[PDB]
Amino acid sequence: SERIESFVETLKRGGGPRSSEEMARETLGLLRQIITDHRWSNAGELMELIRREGRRMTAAQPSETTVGNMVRRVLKIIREEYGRLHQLQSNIIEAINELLVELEGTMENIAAQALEHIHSNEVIMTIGFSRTVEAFLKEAARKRKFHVIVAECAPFCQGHEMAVNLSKAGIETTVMTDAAIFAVMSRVNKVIIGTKTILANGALRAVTGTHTLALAAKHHSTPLIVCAPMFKLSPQFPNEEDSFHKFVAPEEVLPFTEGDILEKVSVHCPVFDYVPPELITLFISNIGGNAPSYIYRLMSELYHPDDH
Amino acid sequence: QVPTRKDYGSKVSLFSHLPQYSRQNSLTQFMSIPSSVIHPAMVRLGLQYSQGLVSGSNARCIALLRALQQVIQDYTTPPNEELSRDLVNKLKPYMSFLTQCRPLSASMHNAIKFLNKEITSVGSSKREEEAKSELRAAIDRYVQEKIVLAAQAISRFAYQKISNGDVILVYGCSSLVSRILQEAWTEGRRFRVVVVDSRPWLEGRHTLRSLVHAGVPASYLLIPAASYVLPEVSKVLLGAHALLANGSVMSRVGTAQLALVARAHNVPVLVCCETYKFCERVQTDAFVSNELDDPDDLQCKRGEHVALANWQNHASLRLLNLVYDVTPPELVDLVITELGMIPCSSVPVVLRVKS
Amino acid sequence: LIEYFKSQMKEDPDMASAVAAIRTLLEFLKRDKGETIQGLRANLTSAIETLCGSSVAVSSGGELFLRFISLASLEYSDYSKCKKIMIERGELFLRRISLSRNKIADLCHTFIKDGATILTHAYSRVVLRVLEAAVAAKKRFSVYVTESQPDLSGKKMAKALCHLNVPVTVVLDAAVGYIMEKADLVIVGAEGVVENGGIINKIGTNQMAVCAKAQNKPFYVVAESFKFVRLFPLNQQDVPDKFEHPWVDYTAPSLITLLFTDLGVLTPSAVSDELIKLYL
């Protein structure tokens, strides 16, 4: 039925399911359902329906790149499925089920490869809460006691919660304000950041302090990993400008109090930022450990030239 | 059985993952001497490593392929087994034994995994002699293919740049960087090599007395003061033995303290490696994958023998002697592989092909 | 054949100098005897005979169509081999090479920044194709050029660009430093590209691009599907014999940002995958 419309409203109003493959489980859900029982013609009328419902879905807040990402991957499974087909619903829904089960284990396998990086007594450093970086760092509690420096930035700040969820289970964290990321980072090694979405050229679109942070990395020459799973490799190299973000209400940065000053003064609030591929020095991923400058072909491994 | 252990001294804080080893001889308190079912043959080589009697980053592959060729040419195929899972399980703790003796590899296993493939690929119904001789035969064709008949071919590319007038600079011992820099005096083109060598287990002398019997002239400088060859160099053919998919070049501990001490004088840096010795890991720094080794070798008998041995009796003075290093591929130019002179950043592109 | 190729490029205000040679070796590959293997070697001699003249791209097309024709040894036949199927396959490879620039423009158009001041140091064909479509559907932009001293050929772009009706200034080639404080998105085309993703173009290119990644502005390059050679230098004064008389210079691939090709948009470290996908 048209419960997807509710879903089309659900992404419209906001209220995030915290990126935990819930957008992916949902997009797989609705694509499974529209894939299940709909109109049927042989010659990709299903694919045309995927383009229509696709572009209607992408008409949401243009930041949830996972929605269109798994949409396009469903299309590539359709194209290869027909490619071998040269009863298709059985093969398509089965392979989509296999992609679901493969998606069902990202946060474990991307966290197994952790002992091979962090060593004893090694002052790691991140910024901003992320599920994968916390799970990833929790499987390195069967090794020695390092430190963790976490930045408290990007207000409204969703960051501390992580400083709790770590320090009551693990290593000796300290929490620094965002405006002190250059007295620190003279005494550190091995920076990690989680990623909101990563671009085709090799860019990280992340939380609103990622840049200003990576610049310090390629100033003191410390390597920064951006641990990010699959299904977040977005096409469309950074052409569209200023729709790249989320501008939120300036209540979060200035209070509605202090009247009259708020007549003539301009307030800005960006949620994301731009990390170019000239500063990332490894990707830890779900299947391999690929470098920055290789990421290109990995994208060609997944998609098809209908990247629009 | 296979006790192992025997760690000696206090590791220097920081990395404790790595285990230091000393010359306690492993079984010199342990092993048996009729046959001692741990190893029919591999106890020979396994004893031969620990003293320092092979140790070249190549030809360990030749050694392990030789001993595994004999032991594979000794198997018995019991009355209730398919001999694929049987032998393929049987080779496990023996390779673990050599793994215990020395850190097992500097990409040596690629061979081991290959053996596990060829063992697993065995047909389910044949003669023991048929599959046996077939197996060791393939085990020969491998070392003929990727170890023998490639290093010759990866010299023909190297002449194309090594031409008359230049002043090359190799570093320490090398396995290929003697062949493809000594099959270039024959066929003319005079030059003047300068070699540079590191303070323990010097290893530079093996070059400087394996090259004067070719006739190309030489010079000699220790790595501590390689800031005088660099205003007269015209290349550096620093070759090494493990390429990691992030474009890292696992050399000996010296290199890439020269490379990023070269590119501040504008002389290029060209690596030379083979086609199996590149591995599918990724590492960011030195302190996750080194291999410490016997910190007693550091003893400079330079007069009154200032206490070196006495350190054990001293309080807090851990000496550390690392074995590998890392070269990040912003300070590395062309890699002269055995499939062309590919760019460094395409270190992964050789992987997908021939796979 | 020399008068034939010169005749082909004489009546041509577009088309590649390289494409002209490609059609020249197409027709002079058609009307010849020796439908056999070693007869192709005679064309190889013609490949040297065409290579008489400079202009590295000619040799690139030489090995290019040399490999395209050379791939007909596989799918083996006798005296009527499928290189004759690469007469029309090739013919459509020539129209494939002919329709190349349009895709490069339709991909490239978007990166102009609507208030941008595009700098260029050349007289390129496809730069003017893409930039002409750029004004012909989109926003406005200034253009600065400098004139290459042993051709003054930049002024040809000044004239033809003034026929495209956009505001152009053109300063001399010594004061590019003074230019770059007031500039963004440096665009240049390129004669040839070496196997690690480096460009060779006119004899001033590195004198800019060294200054491009000091004031942190980007630096793009753009070329068709015919500049990929197996050549591999490593330093200046190690270019081949292709030059007060130098003609081409080198720019290391630690400076070239995202480049454009007929295969699509591309990063400067994926060219090796293309050519190693081809040559072996």
From Swiss-Prot, chain A:
Protein localization: Cytoplasm, Cytosol
Keyword Cytoplasm included in the entry's annotation: yes
Entries under InterPro entries matching the protein: eIF2B_beta_subunit (IPR051855), IF-2B-related (IPR000649), IF_2B-like_C (IPR042529), NagB/RpiA_transferase-like (IPR037171)
GO biological process, alphabetically ordered: central nervous system development; cytoplasmic translational initiation; myelination; oligodendrocyte development; ovarian follicle development; regulation of translational initiation; response to glucose; response to heat
Main localization, broad class: cytoplasm
Positions in coiled-coil regions: none
Keywords: Cytoplasm, Disease variant, Initiation factor, Leukodystrophy, Protein biosynthesis
GO molecular function: ATP binding; GTP binding; guanyl-nucleotide exchange factor activity; translation initiation factor activity
GO cellular component, one term: eukaryotic translation initiation factor 2B complex
Record-linked SUPFAM superfamilies: NagB/RpiA/CoA transferase-like
Description of how activity is regulated: Activated by the chemical integrated stress response (ISR) inhibitor ISRIB which stimulates guanine nucleotide exchange factor activity for both phosphorylated and unphosphorylated eIF2.
Job of this protein: Acts as a component of the translation initiation factor 2B (eIF2B) complex, which catalyzes the exchange of GDP for GTP on eukaryotic initiation factor 2 (eIF2) gamma subunit. Its guanine nucleotide exchange factor activity is repressed when bound to eIF2 complex phosphorylated on the alpha subunit, thereby limiting the amount of methionyl-initiator methionine tRNA available to the ribosome and consequently global translation is repressed.
Similarity comment text for this entry: Belongs to the eIF-2B alpha/beta/delta subunits family.
Name of the protein in its database record: Translation initiation factor eIF2B subunit beta
Species in which this protein is naturally found: Homo sapiens (Human)
Gene from which the chain derives: EIF2B2
UniProtKB/Swiss-Prot annotation, chain B:
Protein family according to the UniProt entry: Belongs to the eIF-2B alpha/beta/delta subunits family.
Chief location of this protein within or outside the cell: cytoplasm
Record's subcellular location: Cytoplasm, Cytosol
Protein function: Acts as a component of the translation initiation factor 2B (eIF2B) complex, which catalyzes the exchange of GDP for GTP on eukaryotic initiation factor 2 (eIF2) gamma subunit. Its guanine nucleotide exchange factor activity is repressed when bound to eIF2 complex phosphorylated on the alpha subunit, thereby limiting the amount of methionyl-initiator methionine tRNA available to the ribosome and consequently global translation is repressed.
MF (Gene Ontology): guanyl-nucleotide exchange factor activity; translation initiation factor activity; translation initiation factor binding
Keywords: Acetylation, Cytoplasm, Disease variant, Initiation factor, Leukodystrophy, Phosphoprotein, Protein biosynthesis
Protein's UniProt name: Translation initiation factor eIF2B subunit delta
Gene expressing this chain: EIF2B4
Organism the protein comes from: Homo sapiens
Disease: Leukoencephalopathy with vanishing white matter 4: An autosomal recessive brain disease characterized by neurological features including progressive cerebellar ataxia, spasticity, and cognitive deficits. Brain imaging shows abnormal white matter that vanishes over time and is replaced by cerebrospinal fluid. Disease severity ranges from fatal infantile forms to adult forms without neurological deterioration. The disease is progressive with, in most individuals, additional episodes of rapid deterioration following febrile infections or minor head trauma.
Residues covered by region (May bind the chemical integrated stress response (ISR) inhibitor ISRIB): 5-14
Transcription regulation recorded as keyword: no
Portion held of the full protein: 166 to 520 of 523
Activity regulation (record text): Activated by the chemical integrated stress response (ISR) inhibitor ISRIB which stimulates guanine nucleotide exchange factor activity for both phosphorylated and unphosphorylated eIF2.
A GO cellular component entry from the record: eukaryotic translation initiation factor 2B complex
Coiled coil region boundaries: none
Top-rank taxon: Eukaryota
Swiss-Prot record, chain C:
Major localization class: cytoplasm
Regulation: Activated by the chemical integrated stress response (ISR) inhibitor ISRIB which stimulates guanine nucleotide exchange factor activity for both phosphorylated and unphosphorylated eIF2.
Keyword Isomerase: no
GO molecular function, one term: translation initiation factor activity
Subcellular location: Cytoplasm, Cytosol
Superkingdom per UniProt: Eukaryota
Keywords tagged on the record: Acetylation, Cytoplasm, Disease variant, Initiation factor, Leukodystrophy, Protein biosynthesis
Alphabetical GO biological process terms: cytoplasmic translational initiation; oligodendrocyte development; response to glucose; response to heat; response to peptide hormone; T cell receptor signaling pathway; translational initiation
Disulphide bond pairs: none
Single GO cellular component term: plasma membrane
Modified residues (N6-acetyllysine): K30
Family assignment from sequence similarity: Belongs to the eIF-2B alpha/beta/delta subunits family.
Assembly behavior: Component of the translation initiation factor 2B (eIF2B) complex which is a heterodecamer of two sets of five different subunits: alpha, beta, gamma, delta and epsilon. Subunits alpha, beta and delta comprise a regulatory subcomplex and subunits epsilon and gamma comprise a catalytic subcomplex. Within the complex, the hexameric regulatory complex resides at the center, with the two heterodimeric catalytic subcomplexes bound on opposite sides.
Chain's role: Acts as a component of the translation initiation factor 2B (eIF2B) complex, which catalyzes the exchange of GDP for GTP on eukaryotic initiation factor 2 (eIF2) gamma subunit. Its guanine nucleotide exchange factor activity is repressed when bound to eIF2 complex phosphorylated on the alpha subunit, thereby limiting the amount of methionyl-initiator methionine tRNA available to the ribosome and consequently global translation is repressed.
Name of the protein this chain belongs to: Translation initiation factor eIF2B subunit alpha
Source organism of the structure: Homo sapiens
Lineage: Eukaryota, Metazoa, Chordata, Craniata, Vertebrata
Gene: EIF2B1
